[model samples]
Target chain A: KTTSSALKGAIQLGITHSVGSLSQKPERDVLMQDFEVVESIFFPSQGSSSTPGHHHGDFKFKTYAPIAFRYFREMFGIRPDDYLYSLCNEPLIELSNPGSLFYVSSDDEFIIKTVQHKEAEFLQTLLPGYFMNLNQNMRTLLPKFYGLYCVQADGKNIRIVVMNNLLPRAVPMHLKFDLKGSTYKRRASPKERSKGVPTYKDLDFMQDMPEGILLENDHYTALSRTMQRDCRVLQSFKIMDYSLLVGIHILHSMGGIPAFNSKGERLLVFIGIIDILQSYRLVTVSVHRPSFYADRFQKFMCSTVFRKS
Target chain B: KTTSSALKGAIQLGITHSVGSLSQKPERDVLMQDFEVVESIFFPSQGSSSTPGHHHGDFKFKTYAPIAFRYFREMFGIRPDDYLYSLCNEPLIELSNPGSLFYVSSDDEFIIKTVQHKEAEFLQTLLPGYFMNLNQNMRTLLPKFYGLYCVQADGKNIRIVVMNNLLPRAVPMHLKFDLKGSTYKRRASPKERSKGVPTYKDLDFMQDMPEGILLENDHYTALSRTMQRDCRVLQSFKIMDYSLLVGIHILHSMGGIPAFNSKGERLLVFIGIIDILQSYRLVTVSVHRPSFYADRFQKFMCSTVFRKS
Candidate 1:
């Protein structure tokens, strides 16, 4: 199970080898054997004159190994120290509208899954790189990437993650509230009409989004969740936060000083002015107000922001 | 090509026919659709005023509606916001490694990746029920099971998660280190051992772990401009940091307070451990100090907490 590094081990021990000084270079070549089989490497003891019993070469303190395991947290979109853990990679996603690469069947309890053979390897191989790209394009919109890790068994690899079973999403169960009902769908407007409605070209997304599919990443899950909750809320809130932070940094420049001859007042004039009394003349109205402020604010306030030069 | 709901052009003014609200009852019937897609959905304009929108209809949200996407976060691990996320039926993960059903060949990178297809789906299909079985197994080491998500997509029905892709590790660049010089070769008899010999099993990780590989995440693209300068320094520092966090936490636990009996002898042990040794000595000479008083004092002085009787 473990290679006896005896020859190397003895030399590793402070033995009086003719090679002289303890200086040595780190080993660089990694044979598949190191990974194919669990090579039991004994960590040399940390024992010194001060550390009396510190074992050498093969000493292992399993307690500290969890730190090395921390890097794996990113493959599934989790942060380090996030307690929710499962000893698995992840199962398949039972998708209602999955990409076309998977089986294309009517949704009568069909599973949304992927499997790639020899020629199909390229399709499957694109995952991690695709994720990195997605993370880059989606830095502002999604969670940052943590990186990926592998599952090793007895020194071999078994990639698993934590996931659950896939039951059919109950019909009418997955409710989607669209903002402007922005569909990924696009169609050609038809000169003809179908059943009184326009007979537009219908393109199922399966055929339209292969390139986009090649770009999919699992981390985008969070963004989808955020959007579903209240897309506008987060987008607008982040905008506001950035604005406030900007204001705080620029507190001295808070006050506005307009350009030359601009009447200190930000104003707009409606073309073709009418008599001021045309709108109102009664004393109860604006005829006697202080500067006619309430008499007709609308008359001056145009919808668009106008910079009076 | 914009839909009637799109804000651009002539379609913007088109009247939107109400498709009618999707029913709220939990559905048992399955759906049959020929396509697979994850459409980006929007929110109801009127819903901007509601406290929470999607969650109010979990029944409608899960089974009946045609929600397009699945979440990778929930698919792999767990998160806090998921319970609160409006449309998050459940989270899902996409394993980084291919499954047993996948077709892989070491010589071909793409084929090595493509094996995810068959191996994964079979395991996924069995996951939900498997978890149900696991829930009843020796439960202490494992946490109690929460309700599982019986997810459905396409026509195939299976559990929400399958315990596969257990871990997908990053294939780090070449790493090499020294064993403090040919240290593993050793004779069984201590009497026959050479003078000044470093013990073969001495786990001097500091002397063992290569500085180049220690801070790998910080030095990706090692030969490229992207590589961090003085990688060894950062890596060495990280090694030190890891040791420190561990040492400090360990000391806190070991020095806190004594519980039950011999309120007298505990004081002697504490006083001795506290006063006599120098920086490295007292810290490393862990066993000389009695476990009880030592643990208690370490807890009290280092951890800043009280250990109960």
Candidate 2:
């Protein structure tokens, strides 16, 4: 539908203007501008000669933490030109789903997913701490955020977060898993299994492979430390309900840092922590301590991999 | 035709890869890498899993002065992201011309015009001197080059030079002039006049406004100095036959640095010196010195404006 195309055009125009406008400004410290920095511009309707015609409707574009995100992107070794080209050069493919809308960049390097107003505000507030953690550990499996933006059009506001696509699009994954340690209804349904690449949940993962994935001693130690540190930070922010999204790529058919299972089959495991902005206070009123989720998450993740002797 | 679209796709892909690859390398001096730096990438035909499907045909992309041009673009206050977005965001509009093929960036910020091998070679040789001149005087009216690239496909090679667009696309110009100072055959033909906004030449400019455009004393001095310096540099390279392209935008209708004529009508003038790559040795065998062209250029340009009293 033209709605998708219109949204795509608005996003591209917004990003182009936002990034282009940054040339005039000097770079500042992340601590100084992380939470307070936001840039907004309004595009009037089509008849207005000042606004470019591609944007047929009236829209207001806003970017949160522009300076901090720019810094983060640079640290991640993403060239701004390459980022823009990947996201704006061609039309983004709309990912069909019932919940929040999702769009993948043409090059499949980045994913732009719509978030709720609450989530957007939470991200803005989380920026200062997020920046610190990322600065300390670039290897954190937390989302590699490139930008957070909002488009207001048709009397509706759509907030979107631009993040790294964990798995390469060209690479074929043999199995995909979404783990949260809890086994309460955490299994794939018949309908989900009907699909070509269904996302199996914690229970499905346990049922499919009783002995979880295996990692070398060095790899296990590194991943354990990063995850433990990431969890501590998340708990400090009172955040929870995040899942470890995993994709298994058979070495004979795909890509990643090569690893092997207990069975000795070569594999490549891609992992990322997703849906991490949910607040623990909002989710529970009982004294089910934040450590409960963190401990369970760590224990389950630890079980997923056994160190090679 | 599809040829134009294919060319555009190839260009966008080339630039995407070229700029993307720069992230892994450290920034070097223009002097160290200007002449010697060349990045070449070959995209094989479709069915090759390594090559993206957007490029259906086989082609080779080459970038000249990657470091130097990147430096020049940065010096001009252009962010790499903005530059890439402007040039690659949308399909470039092909300008109808007989000589070299011309393509304007979608945003109209840059002009990518195809050049012959000889012209490309001349530009490479001119890079060192050009960089020195630009570094010394950013105010010079000489062409502001952003990049030089070549695309070889289907047994043909196309060289293109990316330059700044002298005038903003949105602004409407009342009159456009291309002046070379030489009177021989230097007027717009009736056929040219049939177009919406024909480019009038030297004789027409003199005949149209005999007293010529007037500039304030300060503006006059600055313009004269820049032109003189630019001409000296051109003469040093034995280059000639260039024209000062001028666009007069009625202040009531458009933009630019506000200037006026003898009649005192408010005007916004846009000017740039173009076609400065033609070698003098190749153009003439006579005793006519390089100063003849430079002197005539200066005299005619001086007569085009008088000090505002």
Candidate 3:
């Protein structure tokens, strides 16, 4: 089938073009380049000295804004060379989203996700706001968008986006959840709970953190800030249908030795925001009411984190 | 009439409710919490806890978001205090776009632009693909997106997008051009030509840089990469009606004390892509042809930049 091959080939060219183009912009100043207001563009190679490749009839192949995204990754700490290495040379670990096929880089630093055309369109519109929020606040637990690309293969256009891998390779996490503040009322299925690191959701969160993730008053303060800010940004967009992603890094194994944080704390929690790009545009109303999301999110966070022992 | 005040008073109360509710999220982080994605939410204070604030029957204030936005300031670079400072305490630089209103921060570091609701919507849709190209390269001369915000003010919803100011305050730029590569037979009128800094377009470019921009082979290579990649990205998006923004900074006035770059090279030229957010969806099929856009873009770039000393 020209199906996947077509997209694959297109993306292959897209990546090369981006690398050559975006990596060249100025990067020395954060205020000058870090914000999302950077420039971007696309041009077809119709008039170059070299012969134009066959793009068929009406189809034109052009690499979209390179520097706008170049600054994004750079601002977020990904160098051009590093991005190319992870995206192109690294092996991809298949981690499929139910919506589509997904891949995790070999080093587990970045994710290449397949998205529907409509979703891609939706994201493009939401990105200006998203980046503004990102640039303004470094502490958001929202999805970190590094890149988005489109290509034509087999007479079709394929779209994909890049993001940071929430689960780091160096850390061996004890539990994880894609928790939306909901009462969906389902535990991990037998098949799912059977796995060592399966994703659990709402009901599971409720049943788990009875003791509460122990943290100093200040910890809660910062946690509250991150979540609250994230919520506001999302709500301002009037967007919903998202989650509070959790990663429990109990570095110390049950060998029973206590794991201490920098201040000799017991429990260490690494939490962030995820699945936040979805908007309420498609629906008149969302099941997860905007009014109550904060409450549910807070309760979930409290239950999920335990103070360091 | 209780009309506008009703909404304003209600929003005022709503803001208080948000401060009380949202200011409560945990703040501070063990690791670098700022860079990580955090969680957040919003809920309308359905009924007044201390007595339903004034309401004539079914009417209620639309403080759609306060808690959600409060933390956003703190979490993002705009600190809460600074936010209030810029918003109210500081002097607002009133500027206007062709179809919009704009504001500059007190410090002149960030630009607060008023974007139409539809523009914001269009940006969201364009952001994904826009970002994809951006992530891969930095050579594109496209606008950098920084922030998007909406607020209940003056009895209406005001939507604003933030970006970096393209014209730097420190740099002494002599000529600025908004080149579209189109010879609409338009030239700057004397009224505009009389100004210290005025925008010039295609015809002016042909007249001014008759020989073309001067550059080394390597410089031309880099510039070509930026232009080609930018043109391709713009064309692929089926976007047109954009311009390449250029600024010329020469160090000396008598045309004597020769300007030299850090490498002792004379003069520094800054170029970027701008106004690339246009989409072809609104136009008819035959008019905004994507196939021809790339060709025209390349011809423009080739003619625009020249090797002269």
Best by lDDT: 2
**Best of the candidates, DockQ:** 3
Q: Look at candidate 2 and give me any clashing residue pairs.
A: none
lDDT of 3 by residue, A1-309 (tens): 243443443444456555655456544322212233423223333533322343422223433334456656766888777887776665456663445767776788887787787777677666556655665468677777787776554356656788888777667877777677677655677778888888887777666754545566666666666676677666655566677777766644232223344344464556667766666674367655664676566655655533422
User: What tens digits encode model 2's per-residue C-alpha lDDT throughout B106-128?
Assistant: 88888888899999988887876
Q: Which 10 residues in a row give candidate 2 chain A its minimum summed lDDT?
A: A26-35
Error of 2 at A308 (Å): 41
What's the TM for model 3?
0.49
Compute DockQ for each candidate against the true complex: 0.01, 0.01, 0.04
Which sections of candidate 2 miss by over 4 Å? A1-309, B47-51, B253-255, B281-283, B286-288, B305-307
For residues A150-224, write the lDDT of model 2, one tens digit per residue.
Answer: 998888899999998887577787888988899898999888899887789998988787767877778888888
**Model 3: how far residue A93 lies from native, Å:** 2.8
Report every candidate's CA lDDT: 0.21, 0.78, 0.57
| Arranged by DockQ, best first | 3, 1, 2
Query: How displaced is residue A288 in candidate 1, in Å?
Result: 50
